[PDB]
Amino acid sequence: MKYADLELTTRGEFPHGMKEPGFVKKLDQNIPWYFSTYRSMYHWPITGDNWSDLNEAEKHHDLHMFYTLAWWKLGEGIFDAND
Amino acid sequence: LAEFIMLTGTSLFAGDALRLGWTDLFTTLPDMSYHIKDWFDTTEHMHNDA
Amino acid sequence: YKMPKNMGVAPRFDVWNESYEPWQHMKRMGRLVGTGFYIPPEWYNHFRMFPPINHNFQQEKTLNPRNES
Amino acid sequence: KNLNSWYAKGTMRGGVPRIYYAWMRPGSFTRRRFEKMRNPFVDLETGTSLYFRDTRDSAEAVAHAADSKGLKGMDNAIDLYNEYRIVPDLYPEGFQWKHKLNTEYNQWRSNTWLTPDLIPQEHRGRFLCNFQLNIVAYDMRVVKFSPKDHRQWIYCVLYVGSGKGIAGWGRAVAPSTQEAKKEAIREAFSNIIAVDLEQEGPMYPVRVNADGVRVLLYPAKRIVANFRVADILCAFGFQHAGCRINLKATNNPKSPTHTVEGVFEAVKALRSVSEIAASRGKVPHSLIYNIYPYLEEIRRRKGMMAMHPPGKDGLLMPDRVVDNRLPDHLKKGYYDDVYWKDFFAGSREHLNEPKMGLRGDEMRQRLESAQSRPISSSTGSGRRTLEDVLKRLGKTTKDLGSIPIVNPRLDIKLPTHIKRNYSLH
Amino acid sequence: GDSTINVIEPCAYDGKTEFEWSPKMMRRLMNTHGIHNRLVVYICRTADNRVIDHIQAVKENVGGRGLIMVH
């Protein structure tokens, strides 16, 4: 359905998260305490019933799950019913 | 002897209490209450298996 | 000023034991293993059920020698 | 009425993450040694009689006068899974799977298996925690191996911690930077310390005195302590704590050494709340939700459920002998009515003769499993056994389907096969 | 191996200094940063010539001479 035989040369990486960091020799900030000290404002996870007009949470979880299933190739050739 | 103790005022004792099949246990130790208490102190787990 | 030859490395003669008392390792391994990030030694799996006796205090703290600790 | 909101507590340390337990410590999470009777007590038989102390008076136990058959309540077994948890779980199981070795657990889950010379002997296969090393401060002290010979012995202090609960600190003296670092790391993994993080902080002011540095760990809304001491408490995982040393940083002695030593000494002196309670013999408010199954089984053992059978003890004593053991020629026929003809084909324990009833095909399969045992000279002959005969034919030792031979490597004539195997089929 | 009385202190290293505890003082001990904490037990002798812990002292809102802290 809604097919067009397009092509693609550069896919992303696998979004496994654990892609190597681009290594650097020196730091632009040689201050490590700044990572230990950084506060922020609070992340109040729910305000009242967490209702929002766009489905801001379920929508994003679905859009992350969608592409991660894509990259994982639906994640079932690994094992589903080897038991 | 069943009727005997009732009618004739007589006292039973450690041995005969034992032989009637009344009580299993019997001590000869001193302050056996205290020796129970400290043993059950050193005990640690409160599970029926323990 | 002549001090005892080997004095410098003498042990603290009252608190040298207490590091070793079985109750210390029970208290100190109980939490190490309660954390859930540790695999208790085989002796803890046992002396947990059979914790040491309570009142075997060392003469170095019960300052009483006639005491059958 | 407690205007301290619980919802605004804890001091943010940037990225430093500290563990928090949802309900109870992962140690005290699992209870296999008590649900599965893997304990010295169940082994050592003594006392298993008490579960049947009720049979002191035979007539009384059959009569079921009082429901209180139980060693601890209404039943011998009422709430074996909850009610016993009421006691401050001071010595918890922890991690107890022998599924894969201590080594392979430590290896999969920890950056210490990579560094073997560091963990001393006791802790070797143990840890499952990714320890971050923080090297507090190196130094240099001259070491005089002789009047004429002096070395530069660098002296390290470092604390190997993971805010998951576990953190020790080691200081070392060694001639070189990396060798003193390794030595201190092994001294730290010797001085390892843990913490009952169920309370996520001290619940009473711990006023300890380390080697000259008067320490006070106290409860705060959030970690409020030195940069160094605070990262140590975050290396333990203390979300609500606060340590203060010497009353002020002008008060001597101060040094990176004394700071690390003092805070770790205080965290050692700390007593858990469950340990405080048990020490006072008292039931901690926290764990009383375990007696609620037993309180409810009390309230719901009214009437019919407390009613215990009349005269029925459950102890159905030994009286006689039964032997359904049939002769094998008979059990070979026994189930032939009830299940497949020749039920008993190949159970060694069942059929006292292990081979009988089988068709030669399945016996050939047993033999295919079996391998060629060497041939001593007396057994070795210029005759060609059906083994090498059927080799030369190449066909199979499984091809002779109709031929009642089963084991060609038997040096016996065709009817000698069929007679050594005529008893059976 | 260790004593159940972890620490035990007098309210006053002196006798000439009696420390009457306000009921609010004694209510800010059982309130450790929002967690109700009857852990450290404090003994105070009320006005009624009774000797009670701070827990029954603040369950009846009376404060007493400070006698000891213990835990």
Automatic annotation (TrEMBL), chain A:
Domain of life: Eukaryota
Protein name: Uncharacterized protein
Organism: Trypanosoma cruzi (strain CL Brener)
Organismal lineage: Eukaryota, Discoba, Euglenozoa, Kinetoplastea, Metakinetoplastina
From TrEMBL, chain B:
Domain of life of the native organism: Eukaryota
The protein's name in its UniProt record: Enoyl-CoA hydratase/isomerase domain-containing protein
Organism: Trypanosoma cruzi (strain CL Brener)
Location of this fragment in the whole protein: 444 to 493 of 1181
UniProtKB/TrEMBL annotation, chain C:
Protein's name according to its UniProt entry: Uncharacterized protein
Organism: Trypanosoma cruzi (strain CL Brener)
Residues of the full protein shown: 9 to 77 of 308
UniProtKB/TrEMBL annotation, chain D:
BP GO annotations: translation
Location of region: Disordered: 365-384
Polar residues: compositionally biased ranges: 368-382
A UniProt-annotated Pfam family: Ribosomal_S5_C
MF terms (GO), sorted A to Z: structural constituent of ribosome
GO cellular component labels: ribosome
Domain of life: Eukaryota
Domain Small ribosomal subunit protein uS5 C-terminal: residue ranges: 210-280
Protein name per the record: Small ribosomal subunit protein uS5 C-terminal domain-containing protein
Organism of provenance: Trypanosoma cruzi (strain CL Brener)
